[PDB]
Design a protein around this motif. Structure first.
Motif, PDB file in Angstrom:
ATOM      1  N   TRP A 145      38.803 -12.028 -13.794  1.00 31.93           N
ATOM      2  CA  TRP A 145      37.519 -12.456 -13.471  1.00 31.93           C
ATOM      3  C   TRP A 145      36.799 -11.579 -12.160  1.00 31.93           C
ATOM      4  CZ3 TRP A 145      36.430 -14.500  -8.757  1.00 31.93           C
ATOM      5  CH2 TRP A 145      37.471 -14.873  -8.048  1.00 31.93           C
ATOM      6  N   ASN A 146      37.572 -11.136 -11.478  1.00 32.45           N
ATOM      7  CA  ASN A 146      37.076 -10.522 -10.050  1.00 32.45           C
ATOM      8  C   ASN A 146      37.120  -8.909 -10.086  1.00 32.45           C
ATOM      9  OD1 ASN A 146      37.855 -10.179  -6.591  1.00 32.45           O
ATOM     10  ND2 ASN A 146      35.795 -10.962  -7.355  1.00 32.45           N
TER      11      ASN A 146
ATOM     12  N   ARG B 120      33.248  -5.550  -4.876  1.00 37.43           N
ATOM     13  CA  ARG B 120      33.827  -4.816  -3.669  1.00 37.43           C
ATOM     14  C   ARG B 120      34.843  -5.666  -2.946  1.00 37.43           C
ATOM     15  NH1 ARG B 120      28.840  -0.368  -1.752  1.00 37.43           N
ATOM     16  NH2 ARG B 120      28.125  -0.348  -4.138  1.00 37.43           N
ATOM     17  N   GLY B 121      35.348  -6.731  -3.262  1.00 33.41           N
ATOM     18  CA  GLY B 121      36.521  -7.402  -3.024  1.00 33.41           C
ATOM     19  C   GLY B 121      37.610  -6.951  -4.187  1.00 33.41           C
TER      20      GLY B 121
ATOM     21  N   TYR C 260      42.820 -14.320 -15.081  1.00 32.04           N
ATOM     22  CA  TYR C 260      43.425 -13.348 -14.025  1.00 32.04           C
ATOM     23  C   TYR C 260      42.452 -12.070 -13.609  1.00 32.04           C
ATOM     24  CZ  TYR C 260      47.553 -15.772 -14.912  1.00 32.04           C
ATOM     25  OH  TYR C 260      48.671 -16.752 -15.179  1.00 32.04           O
TER      26      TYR C 260
ATOM     27  N   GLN D 123      33.558 -15.418 -14.814  1.00 31.86           N
ATOM     28  CA  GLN D 123      33.802 -16.780 -14.920  1.00 31.86           C
ATOM     29  C   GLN D 123      35.444 -17.030 -14.935  1.00 31.86           C
ATOM     30  OE1 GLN D 123      30.797 -18.636 -14.732  1.00 31.86           O
ATOM     31  NE2 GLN D 123      30.583 -16.355 -14.172  1.00 31.86           N
ATOM     32  N   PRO D 124      35.861 -17.695 -14.188  1.00 35.39           N
ATOM     33  CA  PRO D 124      37.575 -17.801 -14.271  1.00 35.39           C
ATOM     34  C   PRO D 124      38.116 -18.602 -15.168  1.00 35.39           C
ATOM     35  CG  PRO D 124      36.628 -17.842 -11.935  1.00 35.39           C
ATOM     36  CD  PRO D 124      35.363 -18.318 -12.897  1.00 35.39           C
TER      37      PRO D 124
END
Ligand SMILES: *[C@@H]1O[C@H](CO)[C@@H](O)[C@H](O)[C@H]1NC(C)=O
Ligand SMILES: *[C@@H]1O[C@H](CO)[C@@H](O)[C@H](O)[C@H]1NC(C)=O
Ligand SMILES: *[C@@H]1O[C@H](CO)[C@@H](O)[C@H](O)[C@H]1NC(C)=O
Lengths: 355, 355, 355
Positions: free
Chosen positions: B91-92, B33-34, B89, B83-84
């Motif tokens: 991961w979120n 939710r970011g 780019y 996991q970045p």
């Protein structure tokens, strides 16, 4: 087993054309009848520029002066490999390995010698091997890449146009003759420590060739010969001097710190006078390739590469050599660079340098 | 433990939309939710184009025809990883995995079936999963990336515009629908050895789809359907045919020697007729991507990549795929290239090819 | 043994210029009388902005406040190495290491202190070391590269123009003074969790400097001082504020997620508020380097690099830092890029990040 995938030895049918010791010369061959590209490789391994040095090479390295120990077959490696992991673009070509048994940098044109002494027929051996291949598919070729390493790379510079003219003169002019010169681009520079010209590994490059040519009865390309005084044919063994009059396209591969070059310059932290010398040598070299549009020159202390198995490990400015050769193929038919020269000024300042 | 970081299974609320065996279909979800980016992934794994082949897939691979064995959760991997190190780019993003349980290349639109026989509702399952996600944050999205591998990549090509239109029609037109097609770009070429169409792995791609479509009651995009004769909808399963009428932007990732492609072409040193075939296949493929501005195509013999953990290991012309995807993100808002295609002509001529 | 290749300690001849504890300051030197390039390196290692914090640094880290434990010699590493595998372009330079013993970010200009309390003469120590080197070959120099890491990198930004002016004023104006700032480019941003300014590692960067400057009696460059209010000299410790008024050329090297930066911002899967913070920090940073034409900034969580031995392992967009520094050398005399900034948004999204 491996024999079924190997290049096969053929001795020359004309026995007038021999190795140093009078034994017949020849070539290894593996044809690929899905391909129209041809790869003729000239082996290297120094030379001998007088009778006592040759007698000494015969005791020690008769394999390079004779066909009596040549095996029936050999496995292609590097740019002669049929394995596409090792040979990305050329794995399917017709493969040819010409062993070096003339000790003459492939310049010898002595039709005869006396008995009990050596014959130097380097340039004739190439001519005869080309003749025979015309009877075996070379006739149908698009591209004939004459390649070689060390003395064989210099031999490429000496023989590429003669082959181009041999074929034109024989009425095969669909064939594009090209050259690929590996570790055969030398400087006629001052030695670090000047030493007397006696052994093959102490003799300054200039003096060695100057003597060799007259001993081997060597020939240089006419366009180059005519640019220098008569009796100065030796200049034409130095790539940066012979390159500009070449008619055939030639790709030049060359370690900026070639072991052979360091040996004839008589180089063995490090002394300050020697620091200067090695450094200014990589610079002279870099300099001489500015006008050579197609080249690959890493900052490594090494020797030969194109038939070594790890030839794909080395990179310059992000680019491998097979890739550079491909881009060069393309330039003879922009993201695809063919001029790759390390700027860093000391052997193994590039980290992809092979051990 | 790992469960707290996982995508969570949701069965569809409308039970009319099922897997092959009548069990309800669904999707795994992990919201972020970011983030305003959404990643909808379509699983692959072949198909079955008639009743005996499906019965056989049910005995052997019922996991692909049923939700009865789906676990409550699953760990995101590759482009679904949080996991970045593995997902630089994306991961979120909001992560969504839609399992493949329709055996129909996500083309099925059969509202009903008979009892004791299979239902093919691929395209409806996507539609319903999109509906439900609108109630969970998709409504607020900027970018919806429909992605998939193998049959799922082909499904992307078939469904990306339908989703784009579904959302426009529902009044969410801030949402940019995009596609990412992995290992779903096939050629409708001649088999190396022609074999009869009986098993899923012997049936020439053309024949398989031709039969599948009529069995699954499949649908293709209208713009594509209208470019070919009626009864020739199968053309629209082939990327190079369907791609040009796509309205949504699509990135195409594709091994030049895809294992699935080699299987349907019935391919298993190497024979000379086969050398030709494999080689000319990588070339046909390379050819078809010339007009696809955004693509990644290494010279590897492999299958799928975007949710595999090692997806960052492979490079083409110095560039990794996540980087190529990023540059592509940027091109939709010059040192940042999106057209990456290996020129080298044989599987594993690229050394960064995964084992 | 190794001693013969090392930099050698020289204590300053003027004993008025001391370390924190009144012991004399100095520099390590290794000359290279084949080279005209000079590399002056400013050590870092935090600072102490009041008396109780210094007393605490003396108990714990007196090596950074005193010369009583400095060894006679030290081995050059990274850009101070004489080994060309580790130092490709600069291995032959005159090497100078100035130890940090002033705890003042090299800003201290207090001529005297009281007895029983600390002296802060960072900027004078640099001035005096430059003076002495004029008597030892610096006089004949072409390029003087003032370099430093962490507090030393910030010191470079504070002192590079003062050195340039020191030499001009002394009549050596063939000398090009340049700067190289490593891990000294900080943001004066809000902490993730605001905490009170008490310890050196809890104190927000703004507050720390604001206090330090008045305690150390620090000096900032005049051009920068004059761009901010009187009593706001602290701004001039922040690279993006001081950089534009620099007259000397400066190369900026900076991990986008610097450990020191994260420590003063008080940062220690991961919470969502913290995800935002770390991410927006790499972005603010990236932002501030847009106008810095010559820079190297990987997406790593690290600290310092230019004298670390593995400084050649990290790459950005295919390019290593020594290579970027070289291209920059060339730009002060197009395939040779000097602006290298990772776009990927999380520490270790770049895979060449050192552990
Ligand atoms: C060797 O023999 C072939 C065939 O007779 C001939 O054409 C070629 O020119 C000969 N070379 C010499 C040196 O006699
Ligand atoms: C499934 O149910 C939902 C909610 O009633 C409806 O909007 C959707 O269109 C339905 N699909 C079918 C095939 O009945
Ligand atoms: C230290 O001594 C030298 C030589 O006398 C002088 O030139 C320099 O400016 C002095 N610095 C201070 C702070 O006295």
């Amino acid at each position: 087993q491996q024999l079924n995938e190997d290049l096969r030895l053929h001795l020359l049918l004309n026995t007038s054309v021999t190795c140093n010791d009078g034994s017949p010369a020849g070539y290894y061959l593996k044809e690929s009848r899905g391909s129209r590209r041809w790869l003729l490789f000239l082996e290297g391994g120094w030379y001998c520029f007088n009778r006592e040095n040759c007698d000494s090479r015969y005791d020690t390295m008769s394999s390079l002066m004779s066909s009596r120990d040549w095996p029936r077959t050999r496995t292609g490696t590097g740019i002669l490999s049929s394995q596409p992991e090792e040979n990305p673009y050329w794995w399917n070509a017709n493969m040819v390995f010409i062993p070096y048994c003339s000790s003459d940098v492939w310049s010898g044109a002595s039709s005869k010698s006396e008995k009990n002494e050596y014959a130097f027929m380097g340039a004739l051996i190439i001519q005869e091997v080309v003749r025979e291949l015309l009877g075996r598919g070379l006739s149908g070729a698009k591209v004939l890449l004459l390649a070689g390493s060390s003395a064989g790379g210099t031999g490429v510079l000496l023989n590429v146009d003669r082959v181009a003219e041999q074929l034109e003169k024989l009425g095969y002019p669909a064939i594009q003759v090209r050259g690929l010169a590996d570790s055969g681009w030398f400087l006629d520079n001052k030695q670090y420590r000047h030493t007397d010209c006696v052994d093959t590994i102490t003799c300054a490059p200039t003096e060695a060739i100057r003597r060799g040519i007259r001993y081997w009865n060597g020939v240089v390309p006419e366009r180059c010969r005519r640019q220098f005084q008569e009796g100065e044919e030796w200049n034409c063994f130095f790539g940066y001097k012979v390159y500009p009059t070449l008619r055939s396209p030639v790709f030049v591969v060359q370690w900026l710190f070639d072991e052979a070059q360091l040996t004839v310059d008589n180089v063995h932290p490090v002394q300050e006078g020697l620091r200067l010398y090695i450094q200014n040598l990589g610079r002279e070299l870099r300099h001489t390739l500015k006008d050579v549009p197609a080249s690959f020159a890493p900052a490594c202390l090494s020797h030969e590469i194109i038939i070594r198995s790890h030839w794909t490990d080395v990179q310059v400015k992000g680019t491998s050599l097979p890739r550079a050769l491909h881009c060069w193929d393309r330039s003879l038919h922009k993201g695809c660079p063919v001029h790759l020269v390390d700027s860093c000024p000391w052997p193994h300042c590039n980290p992809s340098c092979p051990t």
